[PDB]
Automatic annotation (TrEMBL):
Inosine 2 binds at G221, L223, E224, V232, K270, Y274. The chain holds residues 213 to 501 of 503 of the full protein. The gene is PKAR. This is Protein kinase A regulatory subunit. Inosine 1 binds at K82, G97, L99, E100, V108, A109, Y159. Transmembrane segments: none annotated.
Protein backbone atom coordinates (compact mmCIF):
# COMPACT_ATOMS: atom_id res chain seq x y z
CA UNK A 1 0.00 0.00 0.00
CA UNK A 2 2.67 2.55 0.97
CA UNK A 3 4.43 1.81 -2.33
CA UNK A 4 1.22 2.48 -4.26
CA UNK A 5 0.63 5.86 -2.59
CA UNK A 6 4.04 6.87 -3.98
CA UNK A 7 2.39 6.82 -7.42
CA UNK A 8 -0.61 8.92 -6.38
CA UNK A 9 -0.52 12.50 -7.65
CA UNK A 10 -2.73 14.80 -5.62
CA UNK A 11 -4.83 17.38 -7.49
CA UNK A 12 -3.61 20.96 -7.39
CA UNK A 13 -5.85 24.03 -7.35
CA UNK A 14 -3.97 27.30 -7.82
CA UNK A 15 -3.15 29.03 -4.52
CA UNK A 16 -1.66 32.42 -3.86
CA UNK A 17 1.25 32.54 -1.45
CA UNK A 18 -1.07 34.07 1.15
CA UNK A 19 -3.61 31.27 0.69
CA UNK A 20 -0.88 28.64 0.99
CA UNK A 21 0.29 30.30 4.20
CA UNK A 22 -3.27 30.36 5.60
CA UNK A 23 -4.02 26.73 4.77
CA UNK A 24 -0.62 25.47 5.87
CA UNK A 25 -1.12 27.11 9.27
CA UNK A 26 -4.47 25.35 9.64
CA UNK A 27 -2.92 22.02 8.72
CA UNK A 28 0.12 22.32 10.96
CA UNK A 29 -2.09 22.99 13.99
CA UNK A 30 -4.70 20.28 13.26
CA UNK A 31 -3.91 16.87 14.73
CA UNK A 32 -4.88 14.94 11.58
CA UNK A 33 -1.70 16.21 9.85
CA UNK A 34 0.65 15.97 12.83
CA UNK A 35 3.23 13.64 11.28
CA UNK A 36 3.26 14.86 7.68
CA UNK A 37 6.49 16.48 6.61
CA UNK A 38 6.67 19.96 5.14
CA UNK A 39 6.64 18.81 1.51
CA UNK A 40 3.54 16.68 2.07
CA UNK A 41 1.71 19.45 3.96
CA UNK A 42 2.19 21.69 0.94
CA UNK A 43 0.84 19.07 -1.48
CA UNK A 44 -2.19 18.55 0.76
CA UNK A 45 -2.79 22.29 1.00
CA UNK A 46 -2.56 22.58 -2.78
CA UNK A 47 -5.22 19.89 -3.14
CA UNK A 48 -7.78 21.72 -1.02
CA UNK A 49 -10.69 23.74 -2.35
CA UNK A 50 -12.54 26.53 -0.60
CA UNK A 51 -16.16 26.06 0.44
CA UNK A 52 -18.57 28.35 2.26
CA UNK A 53 -21.76 27.81 4.20
CA UNK A 54 -24.43 29.83 5.96
CA UNK A 55 -26.07 29.55 9.36
CA UNK A 56 -28.18 26.37 9.59
CA UNK A 57 -26.56 24.73 6.55
CA UNK A 58 -25.69 21.07 7.06
CA UNK A 59 -22.14 20.40 5.88
CA UNK A 60 -23.02 16.72 6.14
CA UNK A 61 -26.01 14.85 7.51
CA UNK A 62 -26.14 11.66 9.53
CA UNK A 63 -26.48 8.64 7.26
CA UNK A 64 -25.13 10.24 4.08
CA UNK A 65 -22.91 8.18 1.79
CA UNK A 66 -22.26 11.07 -0.64
CA UNK A 67 -19.86 13.21 1.39
CA UNK A 68 -16.49 11.45 1.60
CA UNK A 69 -14.75 14.80 2.05
CA UNK A 70 -12.64 16.32 4.81
CA UNK A 71 -13.41 19.91 5.81
CA UNK A 72 -10.92 22.03 7.73
CA UNK A 73 -12.62 25.11 9.14
CA UNK A 74 -11.01 28.47 8.44
CA UNK A 75 -13.66 30.41 10.35
CA UNK A 76 -17.10 29.81 11.75
CA UNK A 77 -18.50 27.18 14.07
CA UNK A 78 -20.65 24.10 13.56
CA UNK A 79 -22.71 21.94 15.91
CA UNK A 80 -22.28 18.17 15.90
CA UNK A 81 -25.81 16.76 16.23
CA UNK A 82 -26.74 13.18 17.15
CA UNK A 83 -30.41 12.24 17.42
CA UNK A 84 -31.43 15.89 17.44
CA UNK A 85 -29.12 16.74 20.35
CA UNK A 86 -26.13 19.07 20.04
CA UNK A 87 -23.18 17.09 21.42
CA UNK A 88 -20.03 18.96 20.34
CA UNK A 89 -18.97 22.33 18.93
CA UNK A 90 -16.46 22.51 16.06
CA UNK A 91 -14.55 25.79 15.86
CA UNK A 92 -11.89 27.39 13.70
CA UNK A 93 -9.04 25.09 12.76
CA UNK A 94 -10.95 21.88 13.45
CA UNK A 95 -11.93 19.18 10.98
CA UNK A 96 -15.20 17.49 10.12
CA UNK A 97 -15.59 14.33 8.08
CA UNK A 98 -12.44 12.66 9.40
CA UNK A 99 -14.32 9.92 11.28
CA UNK A 100 -15.96 8.72 8.06
CA UNK A 101 -12.73 8.88 6.06
CA UNK A 102 -10.66 7.12 8.73
CA UNK A 103 -13.17 4.37 9.48
CA UNK A 104 -15.06 3.97 6.16
CA UNK A 105 -18.56 4.51 7.46
CA UNK A 106 -21.51 6.67 6.40
CA UNK A 107 -21.76 10.03 8.12
CA UNK A 108 -22.25 9.44 11.83
CA UNK A 109 -23.45 12.87 12.98
CA UNK A 110 -25.02 15.90 11.37
CA UNK A 111 -22.71 18.92 11.14
CA UNK A 112 -24.78 22.12 11.22
CA UNK A 113 -23.33 25.63 10.88
CA UNK A 114 -24.17 27.76 13.93
CA UNK A 115 -22.38 31.03 13.11
CA UNK A 116 -23.57 33.48 10.48
CA UNK A 117 -21.15 31.95 7.97
CA UNK A 118 -18.51 29.25 7.81
CA UNK A 119 -15.50 29.05 5.50
CA UNK A 120 -13.74 25.71 5.06
CA UNK A 121 -11.02 24.10 3.00
CA UNK A 122 -12.04 20.75 1.54
CA UNK A 123 -9.89 17.71 0.78
CA UNK A 124 -10.95 14.75 -1.33
CA UNK A 125 -11.03 11.17 -0.05
CA UNK A 126 -8.25 9.85 -2.28
CA UNK A 127 -5.77 12.51 -1.19
CA UNK A 128 -6.68 11.93 2.44
CA UNK A 129 -6.29 8.16 2.14
CA UNK A 130 -3.08 8.26 0.09
CA UNK A 131 -1.21 11.14 1.72
CA UNK A 132 -2.74 11.92 5.13
CA UNK A 133 -4.19 8.88 6.87
CA UNK A 134 -0.95 6.91 7.09
CA UNK A 135 -0.72 4.92 10.33
CA UNK A 136 -3.54 6.83 12.06
CA UNK A 137 -5.34 3.74 13.32
CA UNK A 138 -2.15 2.12 14.64
CA UNK A 139 -1.18 5.37 16.39
CA UNK A 140 -4.58 5.59 18.05
CA UNK A 141 -4.24 1.98 19.17
CA UNK A 142 -0.79 2.71 20.64
CA UNK A 143 -2.14 5.36 23.01
CA UNK A 144 -5.89 5.13 23.58
CA UNK A 145 -5.96 2.56 26.39
CA UNK A 146 -3.17 4.44 28.17
CA UNK A 147 -4.88 7.81 27.75
CA UNK A 148 -8.07 6.34 29.20
CA UNK A 149 -6.13 5.86 32.46
CA UNK A 150 -4.39 9.26 32.69
CA UNK A 151 -5.91 11.34 35.52
CA UNK A 152 -5.73 14.80 33.94
CA UNK A 153 -7.50 13.47 30.83
CA UNK A 154 -10.39 11.91 32.77
CA UNK A 155 -12.75 14.64 31.60
CA UNK A 156 -12.19 13.97 27.88
CA UNK A 157 -14.52 11.60 26.08
CA UNK A 158 -13.31 8.88 23.75
CA UNK A 159 -13.47 11.16 20.70
CA UNK A 160 -11.33 13.80 22.42
CA UNK A 161 -8.82 11.25 23.69
CA UNK A 162 -8.45 9.85 20.16
CA UNK A 163 -7.88 13.36 18.82
CA UNK A 164 -5.05 13.70 21.33
CA UNK A 165 -3.65 10.32 20.32
CA UNK A 166 -3.47 11.57 16.69
CA UNK A 167 -0.78 14.05 17.76
CA UNK A 168 1.30 11.81 20.06
CA UNK A 169 4.63 10.12 19.49
CA UNK A 170 6.79 8.23 21.96
CA UNK A 171 10.19 9.01 23.38
CA UNK A 172 12.23 7.04 25.91
CA UNK A 173 14.89 8.30 28.30
CA UNK A 174 17.54 6.51 30.30
CA UNK A 175 18.26 7.51 33.91
CA UNK A 176 20.05 10.82 34.07
CA UNK A 177 18.91 12.00 30.65
CA UNK A 178 17.28 15.43 30.48
CA UNK A 179 13.75 15.50 29.08
CA UNK A 180 13.53 19.28 29.41
CA UNK A 181 16.38 21.73 29.94
CA UNK A 182 15.99 24.99 31.83
CA UNK A 183 15.81 28.07 29.63
CA UNK A 184 14.55 26.38 26.41
CA UNK A 185 11.66 27.60 24.24
CA UNK A 186 9.20 25.04 25.62
CA UNK A 187 7.47 23.28 22.73
CA UNK A 188 7.02 19.70 24.03
CA UNK A 189 4.44 18.37 26.49
CA UNK A 190 5.22 14.91 27.84
CA UNK A 191 2.87 12.45 29.50
CA UNK A 192 4.76 9.88 31.54
CA UNK A 193 3.81 6.35 30.48
CA UNK A 194 6.40 4.69 32.73
CA UNK A 195 9.09 5.84 35.12
CA UNK A 196 9.91 8.74 37.40
CA UNK A 197 11.34 12.20 36.70
CA UNK A 198 12.70 14.98 38.88
CA UNK A 199 12.00 18.68 38.35
CA UNK A 200 15.11 20.80 38.96
CA UNK A 201 14.58 24.54 39.31
CA UNK A 202 16.96 27.35 40.15
CA UNK A 203 17.10 28.85 43.64
CA UNK A 204 17.64 32.51 44.55
CA UNK A 205 21.39 32.08 43.97
CA UNK A 206 20.84 30.55 40.52
CA UNK A 207 21.85 27.05 41.64
CA UNK A 208 19.96 23.87 40.75
CA UNK A 209 17.37 22.92 43.37
CA UNK A 210 15.06 19.92 43.42
CA UNK A 211 11.42 20.98 43.18
CA UNK A 212 9.42 17.72 43.04
CA UNK A 213 9.06 14.41 41.25
CA UNK A 214 6.47 13.16 38.78
CA UNK A 215 5.67 9.63 37.71
CA UNK A 216 3.32 7.52 35.58
CA UNK A 217 0.28 9.47 34.41
CA UNK A 218 1.77 12.87 35.24
CA UNK A 219 2.53 15.55 32.65
CA UNK A 220 5.42 17.98 32.22
CA UNK A 221 5.97 20.88 29.83
CA UNK A 222 2.54 22.46 29.97
CA UNK A 223 3.46 25.53 32.03
CA UNK A 224 5.34 27.24 29.20
CA UNK A 225 2.37 26.61 26.88
CA UNK A 226 -0.16 28.06 29.33
CA UNK A 227 1.80 31.17 30.28
CA UNK A 228 3.97 31.81 27.20
CA UNK A 229 7.47 31.70 28.65
CA UNK A 230 10.67 29.71 28.31
CA UNK A 231 11.20 26.69 30.51
CA UNK A 232 11.90 27.39 34.16
CA UNK A 233 13.19 24.00 35.26
CA UNK A 234 15.04 20.98 34.03
CA UNK A 235 13.16 17.70 34.02
CA UNK A 236 15.50 14.73 34.41
CA UNK A 237 14.71 11.02 34.18
CA UNK A 238 15.47 9.29 37.48
CA UNK A 239 14.60 5.84 36.10
CA UNK A 240 14.12 4.61 32.60
CA UNK A 241 11.23 6.74 31.38
CA UNK A 242 8.76 6.26 28.55
CA UNK A 243 6.78 9.32 27.48
CA UNK A 244 4.06 10.20 25.07
CA UNK A 245 5.00 13.54 23.51
CA UNK A 246 2.77 16.33 22.13
CA UNK A 247 4.04 19.35 20.20
CA UNK A 248 3.01 22.82 21.33
CA UNK A 249 1.43 23.49 17.93
CA UNK A 250 -1.24 20.88 18.75
CA UNK A 251 -1.82 21.84 22.38
CA UNK A 252 -4.79 24.16 21.86
CA UNK A 253 -6.63 21.64 19.69
CA UNK A 254 -5.96 18.48 21.71
CA UNK A 255 -6.09 19.77 25.27
CA UNK A 256 -8.37 22.82 24.97
CA UNK A 257 -11.01 21.19 27.19
CA UNK A 258 -8.41 20.70 29.95
CA UNK A 259 -6.57 24.04 29.64
CA UNK A 260 -8.34 24.81 32.96
CA UNK A 261 -7.59 21.62 34.92
CA UNK A 262 -4.01 22.50 33.97
CA UNK A 263 -4.18 26.04 35.33
CA UNK A 264 -4.77 24.46 38.78
CA UNK A 265 -0.99 24.29 39.16
CA UNK A 266 -1.46 27.51 41.18
CA UNK A 267 -3.19 25.55 43.94
CA UNK A 268 -0.97 22.47 43.96
CA UNK A 269 1.76 22.81 46.60
CA UNK A 270 4.04 21.17 44.04
CA UNK A 271 3.96 24.42 42.01
CA UNK A 272 5.02 26.85 44.77
CA UNK A 273 8.38 27.16 43.01
CA UNK A 274 6.71 28.10 39.73
CA UNK A 275 4.35 30.61 41.29
CA UNK A 276 7.38 32.36 42.77
CA UNK A 277 9.07 32.32 39.35
CA UNK A 278 6.05 34.11 37.91
CA UNK A 279 5.71 36.48 40.87
CA UNK A 280 9.36 37.56 40.73
CA UNK A 281 9.36 37.82 36.92
CA UNK A 282 12.13 35.26 36.45
CA UNK A 283 11.19 33.99 32.97
CA UNK A 284 11.11 35.55 29.53
CA UNK A 285 8.38 35.19 26.91
CA UNK A 286 7.98 32.39 24.40
CA UNK A 287 4.99 31.99 22.08
CA UNK A 288 3.70 29.17 19.91
CA UNK A 289 5.40 28.98 16.51
O1 LIG B 1 -18.56 12.32 19.13
C1 LIG B 1 -18.14 13.19 18.43
N1 LIG B 1 -17.50 14.20 18.98
C2 LIG B 1 -17.02 15.22 18.21
N2 LIG B 1 -17.20 15.20 16.86
C3 LIG B 1 -17.84 14.20 16.29
C4 LIG B 1 -18.33 13.18 17.08
N3 LIG B 1 -18.96 12.28 16.17
C5 LIG B 1 -18.79 12.85 14.94
N4 LIG B 1 -18.19 13.91 15.14
C6 LIG B 1 -17.83 14.68 13.96
O2 LIG B 1 -18.87 14.91 13.08
C7 LIG B 1 -18.48 14.42 11.76
C8 LIG B 1 -19.65 13.72 11.10
O3 LIG B 1 -19.96 12.49 11.74
C9 LIG B 1 -17.26 13.54 12.04
O4 LIG B 1 -16.43 13.37 10.91
C10 LIG B 1 -16.61 14.27 13.20
O5 LIG B 1 -15.92 15.43 12.74
O1 LIG C 1 7.05 24.40 40.47
C1 LIG C 1 6.95 23.46 39.72
N1 LIG C 1 6.35 22.38 40.17
C2 LIG C 1 6.18 21.29 39.38
N2 LIG C 1 6.64 21.26 38.10
C3 LIG C 1 7.26 22.33 37.62
C4 LIG C 1 7.43 23.44 38.44
N3 LIG C 1 8.14 24.38 37.62
C5 LIG C 1 8.32 23.76 36.43
N4 LIG C 1 7.81 22.62 36.53
C6 LIG C 1 7.81 21.76 35.35
O2 LIG C 1 8.95 21.81 34.58
C7 LIG C 1 8.59 22.18 33.21
C8 LIG C 1 9.61 23.12 32.64
O3 LIG C 1 9.56 24.39 33.27
C9 LIG C 1 7.19 22.76 33.36
O4 LIG C 1 6.43 22.75 32.17
C10 LIG C 1 6.61 21.88 34.45
O5 LIG C 1 6.24 20.62 33.92
Amino acid sequence: DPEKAKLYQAPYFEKSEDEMNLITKLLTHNVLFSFLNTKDIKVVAGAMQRATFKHDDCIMEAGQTTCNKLYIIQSGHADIIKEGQKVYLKTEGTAVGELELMYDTPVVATVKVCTDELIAWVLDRDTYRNLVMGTAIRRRETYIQFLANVPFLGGLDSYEKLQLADALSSEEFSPGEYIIHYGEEGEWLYIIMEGTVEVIGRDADGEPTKVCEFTQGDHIGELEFLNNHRTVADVVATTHVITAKLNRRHFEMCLGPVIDVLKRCADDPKYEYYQNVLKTGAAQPSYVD
